[PDB]
Each structure stands twice: as C-alpha cells, then as structure tokens.
Design a protein around this nucleic acid. Structure first.
Ligand SMILES: [Zn+2]
Ligand SMILES: [Zn+2]
Ligand SMILES: [Zn+2]
Ligand SMILES: [Zn+2]
Lengths: 522, 519
DNA sequence: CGGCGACGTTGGGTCAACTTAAATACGTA
DNA sequence: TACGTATTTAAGTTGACCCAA
RNA sequence: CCGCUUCACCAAUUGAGUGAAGGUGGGCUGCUUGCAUCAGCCUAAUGUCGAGAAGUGCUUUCUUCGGAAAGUAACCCUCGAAACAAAUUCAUUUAGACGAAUGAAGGAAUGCAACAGUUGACCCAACGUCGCCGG
DNA sequence: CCCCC
C-alpha cells in the first residue's frame, strides 16, 4: 500500500543550538547592515531580490556579483571565536573526523559480524537455523558487537539491518555464495530509529523554512593515546543514555526552492515539503561522502521514506504493453485503442558502446602509461567517466520511464504487462555475452519502469516471453517462420503475417502481443 | 607455475570393460546400419566412405547413427551390476560433486574458524605458528578423517594455508575469500621430488589416462536426511585401493562451436610423459567457460624454475613508421607486431590546437596598446610544454618498444636511417603533423633505451620499401601513395602469393630483413 | 594479433534484501 | 500512573542434475 | 588542426576527401543530477610528481618445510596533488607585482527534463604482465 | 523453449 523511496540531501552545516544560531544569524545580519551602509552609492550591483528589502541602485546582477550577499559569508576568525566562546558547540572538524571514523568502523563491524554470524550459525550452531533463528542471531551478534563498539542504538541497529540485508542463510548453507565482505571506503552509516505507531523517527524540525534533522548521539571524547597505524580512530562515543549530545544537521533545500515544481503535490520537492511538515516519517538514514568539492568532501544524507499511491483516474480494464528492444528502445501499445508510443531520444546502448570504446582505448596499453603510484591512481581517468556515465544512464532511464508513464496515464491504462526476462541472464550465446550483456540494461530499464508505474497505482504483470515477436497481433497465427535467425538474415524487417497480410513494426507487434491479457503470468 | 587444464569425457574402466563398451558402440552402429537400408540420408561427415549408402552430407551432429551410438543409461546400470569395479560418469559425477561440496565446506569453515580464533576470541595477537597449529591439529585431522585420502587432506591444508593471508587480514586491507562449491577445485597433492613421478599418466589415441589413487566409496547404510548430498564413505587408501583412471582430452569448443585441439597444453603433456616435467598437483573442478559449465575439467599444476634466456643475435627485429599509427615494430620469422597507438598523441594535439585557436582569437581586442608582444606572451610556453610532452611521450614509446623486444627475445633491431625516415610520404608525420616532430631525439632515445638492455642497432636504409613483400621479393609497384589515398589506405594483398596482411606490417617487415647490408 | 592456463585490477550487467515491531530500562511530569 | 527516548530482542536443518565428444 | 558540427559537391555508409562559416575539440565550481547556455578558472591532464612501507616481489642473516627480522621501492603497491568568488595574514623588488598559505557554516546562474538509495552476491567483459601452440 | 543482437 506504500512505496519506499529515499531522498538524497546535502548537509549544509551542523546546527548547534538556538542561542548559537541566533548569534550566527545576527552576525550575518550585522555584516549585511555594515555592507548596506558602507556601500552608500559606491556600488550598483544590488541583486534583484536585494533591491526590494534595502538598496538604492539601478541595475540587476546575477546574485554572484552582489556585494551584500557576499558580505553575509562568515570567515574563520568568527568560528574560532565561537569555538572559544561555546566549547560545547559542534563544528566540522569534529564532525568530519567522527563521520570518517564511523564509516571505517562500521565497515569493520560489518565484516567481523558477518564472519561471527557464519561462525555462530554454521560452525557453532551446526547449520540448524530457521529464518527467525537468523533474526535472533542478527540481534544477538551484529547488534551486540556494534553496540559494544558504538554505544548508540541507532548505529548498532542500522548495522544489524545492513548485515540483515546481505546475509542469505540458505544460500550460505547450500554454499551458493561467498560470505559478504566490504572493501569500500565510502561505506554508509545506516542509522535506524523506530517510527511505527507511537514513535516518530529522528525528529525533523523546520525552524525557518529549513530542513533540520536530529541524530541521537553520545558525548564524544578524543582518545588519549591515538594509534599511529590507525590515526582516524580518535573518539570514544559514550552511551546516549549516560551523556547524550545529539548531532543536528541542516540539509540543503535552497536550490530545490527555485525548482519548477516546489509549489506542487507530486515531485521530490513535495516529498521534502511533507517531511518538513511532519508528515512522512523516516526510519532510515544513510550518511555517505560525495565528491571532493574543493579539497573537502561533501557529505550526503539519504532519508528513506514511505509514500502513498496517487489516484490519476486509472483503471485496470485498459491493458497496456511494453516491448523492450535494443534497436527500437521502448514501444508502448494499448490493447484495443489504436494508440502507440515510441522512444526516439539518445540511446543508452550507443552511450554504453561509446563509454566501452573509450574505456578500451584508455586501458589498451597501461604498462608504462601512469605507473608506479598504485592501482587507484593508475585507473583515475576511467572512474571519473564512470560516475558521470552512471548518472547519465540513470537520468536517461528515468526520463524514458516518465515519458512511458505519462503516455499510459494519458490513456488511463491500469495494467501494464511486461516480459519476464529472468532467463536472459543464463544465456550461453557468445554474441549476447560479448556484444550485448554488459551494455544493454534491459532489467534496470524494466525495474525503473515498474517503479514509475507502481507510483501511480499501475500493476505490472511479468508475462511469459515465448513466441511473442512472431505471433500476429490481429489474428494470433503464430508465424513459425519468423525466427531469430530469419530476423537476423533479413536485416530485421517489418512484421508480415502469412494469413492476414498484416504490416506493422516488429517492435510494435511484440508490444501489442505483450499487451494481451490471455498470456499466463510468470 | 603452469596449470594446464584438460577435459574429462569419461572414466577409463579397464581393458576388458572398455572393450565391451567399444564393442557395444560398434554393435549398435552395425544394427543401426542393417535396420536402415537407405531409409534416411544423413550418411555422417565421413562414414559415407567407410560403410554407408546415402546421398547427401550432414555435419555429423544431425545424423541417425550417432544418436544410437550414444549409449543408454540402463546399459551402464546393468554393467555396474555385472562389473562391480567399473566406474562411470553418473557415479563419478556424484562423487565429484560430493567431494567438491565437502572440501568447500571444510575450506569455508576453516577460514571462518581461523578468523574467529585469531581476530575475535584471540584479540588479534596470533603469529603464523598459531595458524600452523590450528591447521595441523584441527583441519588436517578433520580432512583426514572425513575422506581418508591424505592427498585431499594435505591439499586442502595447503590451499587454506596459502589462501589465509594473515598479514593482509590483520590490518583489514582485505576480507575472507569464500567460494561457491562449484568453483572449488579438489586439490590432490602428491610429492614431486625424485621417487614419486606423480600420478602415473599414460597415453591413448590423441587422449591421455590419469591414474589417481583413491578409495572404495561404500554407500552409506542410512543417508542423513538433513545433509542429503553426503552419500559415500571413502574407505582408506592403504586398506582397499581402487585407483580411478580418467580419460583426458585436449578438445575445446571455439566459443561453443566445434572441438578444436588445444596444442598449447598438448605439447606440455608430451613433455610430461617423456620423463622431465614431474607433476605435483591434480585439481578437479567444474568448467568455467560457456557451454562447459557441466563439464569436469582437470588442472595439472606443474612447477618450473624462473629461468631467463637473455637475448640472442639470431633474432632480428625492425621498426618502421606507419600511416594510421606512428611506429610499427615487427620480427621477420615470427608474427609479433607491436603497433604504437595514436589516440593520446591525437587528443593532446586536439587540445593544443583548441588552445591555439582560442589564444590567437581572443588576443586581437583584449591584448592591445602594447603591440603584438602583449599578444605573444602565452604561446611560447604552451609549445615549450608541448615539446616537453613529446619528449616524455617518446621516452614512453622507447620504454614500450624495448619491453616488446626484451619479451620477444630480440638481440639486434634494425631501424631505417634518419634522413630516410623523415623523407617519407608513407609516415603518420608529414600527413597529419606537417613537420613538427623531433626525429633525431626520437631515434636517439630509442637507440639509448635499446642499448640499455644490450641490444645493438643497425641502420640498413632500404632503397625502396613499403611495397616490397616479405614472403617473396616481388616489388609490387601498384602501391602508389596516390593510389593509397583514393582507395582509403587498403591492406597489403600479394599478387602471386595471395598473402593478406596489413600495409603497416609488411613495410615494417622489409626493414627487419637481414639480407640488406648496413649503411 | 588469434587461442589456451594462472594471478591481479577494474567496469558493469542481474538479482536479493533493507528502509521492522513489541517490550523495557532510565528518567521525568 | 502517563509519557518519552534510547535500548534490546525475536529462534532450530532437509542436494540437483539430468552426461561416456 | 580536428578520427568536430552543419550545408554543398565528387568516387564507391566508410575519405583520417574538396570548399565556406562556426567551436575546447578536455575538464572544475555554481549548493541532488543530466543537456544546453552564462560568469570565472585550470589544462603537458589519456600528463607529470610528492611522502611512505601494510602487501606482491627482490637481497642478506637465522632450526631454517613452515616463518621472523632488517633493507631496497619494480608493482593493476597505499594515501594524495590543477581548476569560481568575497575575506584574512606573511615575505620580497620598485598604490602596484610575485611567491604563498590557513578553509566547509547556504557568497554564486537561466531554461527544459527528471529526482529511491545503499550494501552484497553471482556472472560476463576489457586490460596488464607471466608462460606454452600456430599461421 | 522463446524474449535479444
Ligand atoms: Zn544580494
Ligand atoms: Zn494473421
Ligand atoms: Zn557413422
Ligand atoms: Zn609475395
């Protein structure tokens, strides 16, 4: 009945108190008054918003070239004054050292507690374990070690949920996988705090149109003798019941207030307005690093969120279908309505070929290229393009999914059937393996279209894919001549029926056969 | 160490049982012949010559005779009733799967119990003596009492001792490598040194016979319901010996196509039987390639000493410029080319010409009042940095070329002469980069990097290369440069020899010929 | 530049699982 | 006793491949 | 210059061809992302280096199968290093110039389109060396 | 056993 999501927000700064933030806001307003009175007709770069409240000038500038906006920025002498004046305040050096230490010890506890679970279940408990015995062993092992290190209960139960997400019991009993280990460096901090029924969850306050989140935390004390092999470990984290000290964080919604739908009811901005209202409680929080934005890393925060379904006036008596192809990207059909949709944008397949070709050039003769300073340094140009290509892929798939969903909602289509495609991964074909496997995300496309349709109350039926491209959509003749080897050697032609003389596209015919409700779901 | 992987098509029973099986395939072929007096017309790929009366050919795979020549399960079942010692591919597939799952279980649980005893209950203070104590007191004894072979026990103990990396696990650079019990190999250590030749491998008609000593495998009197895969017992080696003989083939699929003979392992197996190359490690594992996942493949690991050759002056190499790549290397009697790629040069030049086109456009109005001198400040430095880039690129190319000639064991490289190198319309330079290249610095750094490694240079300077073929000295004069430009730079096709190869490589071959004297 | 066998790094496909719920110490109103 | 927030705890097996080029 | 875009042409979509115009033809920051534009900047960047010693390797010593110590630094060894703006401080030549730091706290666009994210497992592919076989 | 080059 509810659909789970995450919101990704950027941490502006740690929020501190109400008196220290009153001092910060008044120092910003004092600098604004100082620059608003010292620039007495000396400058004329008042920004369009700054003309209204107080300025006496003519022209409008881009808000980057304002001088009263520029003066509101606080320097480092004010923050060493505030660290001296309020020594119980919370600033970024403590916070970034805590967050990096949390990340590294959460990865270490994840590894050691999965190995300890494998011991207690399979070596000590002789393999005898149900699923509820895995629930007991998770809360008895992973929570207990994580709460023996971090005396938070939020981090310890978040690490229990992170180990629970990746511990598969019968796959490790039947030896169908290896035991999971982390090698990652940006491992999240998983941070559950319960939200059902009589609980609220993490206590998001909205002070002056801001996104303040509060993290229940202990009183950190710097280690006396810091270890020289592991110098990131320099805090102690007392118990949250003995001596609490909750880290509040301000989260970046200033850019999102300029976005086109913030005064709407459906986007990511309406979800953030609802979380700001006190609707849409969150029970899950992940803190990760972003990219190194000017030699100091950005920290992002993911708010898991449970969202209802939207009405849209959409009924399951109208049935649609989607044919996932590599030549033609995505073609949507309706069962009886003579309506049709066909993607025509830039393609993810051509983009994957281009990125693979460039990656082949850059890897092609590495031995003297940038040698001598490690594996990470050596493969630096490719990874910078891998982040950008993953972002471009994801945004292209999401734009295709919104075009598909806008088509299907415009025709009031309630059930979209799709192909099963659970057997494609097992294919022994050399061509598929070497030329089509890693460059054609059919299932990531399918999952994002299931997600986008599921947000609107549209059901998705995985429909068995046998003889779908060759059966005719008018009179279901099952043209057996229209095999894949004939679709190959005829250079992938239109569909021609043998007893109807029916002529439509090969990707639209299989879209209108996928749309048929008679086929058995799988 | 070299690991040579073979297939297993079937076990080798004995002389008499394999005689009965081969006579049964011949008798089924004879009965399928005499019941079909030209009913169907498949005729096999070549059985048409020996004994068939049928019209057209088939690929041997859609024939009628082979699907009768493929035996039936019940025949092997009545043979297993009639012969108690004959081993077949269903029973030994069960034994291989159960031994794979057992050894993977012992390996996984021994790594996790090592990690527990060392890093969790033992607070991270544990030398390798505690690892050797755990192995020889717990894991070797467990593997020597579950399956009583000392080969699989001392192979599992060695695979865990080598695969448990204490120095990399103490500092948490890595985690534990745990497997999937289909990718796990069954180790089977025996000695290499002197007395033990190792597993007593013999030969067949383009096949091999490996005689692993093993046990008797009485079936369990009551299968354990909660572990249903463990259905054998593995009685001891010295009490009831029953050595498995397997039949090993070199055939592999050409990416799921027909069987090609792999001669790269086959030569090494010939060196095994001839008396040298004593083997010491026979792993059994499932196949990893496509259309081989249900095939049991047998890796012979064999140890060779790290012995260099040096360079020998009989091998003669050559460097010549190309038209799509700046430098092509070649050896006369081998294939062995090494074409230096263009893309980093091309993209450096693309960015340098973009910076030139920009700094010569936004100087006419901005840089003004002081003359052209104000304009000239930026370019002098960009081209200086470009020359330093070209110098580092030429040093990288010299490193690549010298690594190529050391790996391919070349002792004397013959380069074209300097003025004959630069006066060339068949170069990548003078077509794209109009003149801007240090040929003298390039040749001096290639000469110095090669003379660092004890390789001579010769300066042969041919009269007319880039159209003379190598296999015959034809002087194919139809290679005009103006012909090459209009025909989109085509390959080298010999007229009388029909030798199809690259136009860069045969031109790199005519420099490497020793029949033309130094100049 | 093609195969074949190891080891190593990476990228990048599918797929699975998480984003729970009841009870209780410790403290306060 | 009502409420809040941080803390802890929930239990027991049961393969899989289907082939002698 | 373009293995850059568009238009016109020729030969048979490749030319890494002819002509005219235009443009980083590679990136960074602009407050979650993508594309285009805009302001500023870097660019030898598919580059060149710094510091180290946990590991692979290598040398020496030791009961020396195992393994440990010390060192060397080849490594697809570890960590890093270009790129918006206001502010602050110092040195040096004659208000200006250079070197140059300490750093986060909403100082930074416009338009269109979006905005579940993380962890792990399995598999395939590319590449690097290391050996064998063939034309 | 087809869905996809
Ligand atoms: Zn302003
Ligand atoms: Zn029809
Ligand atoms: Zn025959
Ligand atoms: Zn010839």
């Amino acid at each position: 009945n509810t659909i789970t999501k995450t919101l990704k927000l950027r941490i502006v700064r740690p929020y501190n108190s109400a008196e220290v933030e009153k001092i910060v806001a008044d120092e910003k307003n004092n600098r604004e008054k100082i620059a608003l009175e010292k620039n007495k007709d000396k400058v004329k770069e008042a920004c369009s918003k700054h003309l209204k409240v107080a300025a006496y000038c003519t022209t409008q500038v881009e808000r980057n070239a304002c001088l009263f906006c520029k003066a509101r920025k606080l320097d480092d002498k004010f923050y060493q004054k505030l660290r001296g004046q309020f020594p119980d305040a919370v600033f970024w050096q403590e916070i970034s050292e805590i967050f990096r230490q949390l990340q590294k010890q959460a990865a270490e506890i994840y590894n050691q507690s999965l190995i300890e679970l494998y011991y207690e279940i399979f070596i000590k408990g002789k393999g005898i374990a149900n699923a509820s015995s895995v629930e007991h062993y998770l809360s008895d092992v992973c929570y207990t070690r994580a709460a023996e290190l971090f005396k938070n209960a939020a981090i310890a139960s978040g690490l229990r949920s992170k180990i629970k997400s990746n511990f598969r019991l019968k796959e490790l009993k039947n030896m169908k996988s290896g035991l999971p280990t982390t090698k990652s460096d940006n491992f999240p901090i998983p941070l559950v705090k319960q939200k059902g029924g009589q609980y609220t969850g993490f206590e998001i306050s909205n002070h002056n149109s801001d996104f303040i989140i509060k993290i229940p935390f202990g009183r950190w004390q710097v280690k006396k003798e810091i270890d020289k092999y592991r110098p990131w470990e320099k805090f102690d984290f007392e118990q949250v019941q003995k001596s609490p000290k909750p880290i509040s964080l301000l989260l970046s919604t200033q850019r999102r207030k300029r976005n086109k739908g913030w005064s709407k009811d459906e986007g990511t901005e309406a979800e953030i307005k609802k979380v700001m209202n006190g609707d849409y409680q969150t029970s899950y929080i992940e803190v990760k690093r972003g990219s190194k934005i000017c030699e100091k890393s950005a920290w992002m925060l993911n708010l898991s969120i449970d969202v209802p379904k939207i009405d849209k006036g959409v009924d399951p008596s109208i049935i649609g279908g989607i044919d996932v192809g590599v030549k033609s990207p995505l073609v949507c059909a309706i069962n009886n309505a003579f309506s049709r949709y066909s993607i025509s944008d830039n393609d993810l397949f051509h983009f994957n070929k281009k990125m693979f070709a460039r990656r082949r050039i850059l890897l092609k003769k590495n031995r003297h290229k940038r040698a001598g300073h490690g594996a990470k340094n050596k493969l630096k140009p490719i990874t910078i393009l891998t982040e950008k290509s993953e972002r471009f892929r994801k945004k292209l798939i999401e734009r295709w999914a919104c075009e598909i969903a806008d088509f299907f909602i415009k025709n009031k289509v309630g059930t979209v059937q799709m192909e099963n495609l659970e057997s494609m991964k097992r294919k022994e074909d050399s061509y598929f393996n070497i030329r089509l496997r890693g460059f054609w995300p059919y299932a990531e496309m399918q999952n994002k279209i299931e997600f986008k349709l599921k947000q609107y109350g549209i059901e998705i039926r995985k429909v068995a894919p046998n003889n779908t491209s060759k059966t005719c959509s008018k009179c279901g003749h099952l043209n057996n001549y229209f095999n894949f080897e004939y679709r190959k050697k005829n250079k992938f032609p239109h569909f021609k029926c043998e007893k109807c003389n029916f002529k439509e596209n090969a990707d639209y015919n299989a879209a209108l056969n996928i749309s048929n409700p008679k086929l058995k779901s799988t």
